[PDB]
Amino acid sequence: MIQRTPKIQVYSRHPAENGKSNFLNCYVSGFHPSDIEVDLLKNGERIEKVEHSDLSFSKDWSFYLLYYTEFTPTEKDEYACRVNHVTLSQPKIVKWDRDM
Template identity: 60%
Template sequence: MARLFLFAVLGQLFILPYLDAITSSPKVQVYSRHPPDSDKENFMNCYVSGFHPPQITIELFKDGKKIEKVEESDLSFSNDWTFNRLVSAPFDPKSKNDYTCKVTHSTLQLPKVVKWDPENN
């Protein structure tokens, strides 16, 4: 009985904190590298964080059409064993185009779509 109690306590101390990381939904932030009114060449960034398992699809769109030439960072992870990734593409923030980031992950019933908003950049 004492062994069972000890196992339960050790499980709560050492295993349970990592069970949350087994499935964790992604958080999505879409922003430009430079201020929208800057004259510098700009990039739309889609930063996806806090997800587990690591298999994820991140796509960028311009007016509903997939942007094919994107840069994708290496997959990295945080202290809590969740993962992070940055996907970016050149864009013109002064244009009237709609830019979105679509994230597909096993923890989501439907893909998460986040629109770039110059007002909240």
């Protein structure tokens, strides 16, 4: 059995403008096996309404998924993605940086 830890990127669909609706994305890739837990967080709290793409994989057999939710960014609201996988000793949090 070959295991691989996920790469994680957290970003918006469109350039962020405060007070305008958008989509918050967390793209997880390069992982094996396929079982993975991904939450989007708003000020540290789990966002209830989150959708995801259908499980697919790359040339190297490693999996990828896009998790996404519609949201309206503001000045002061902080967003993040929290991921757990068998390869991680604890959950990994990546903060949304509007410039990354």
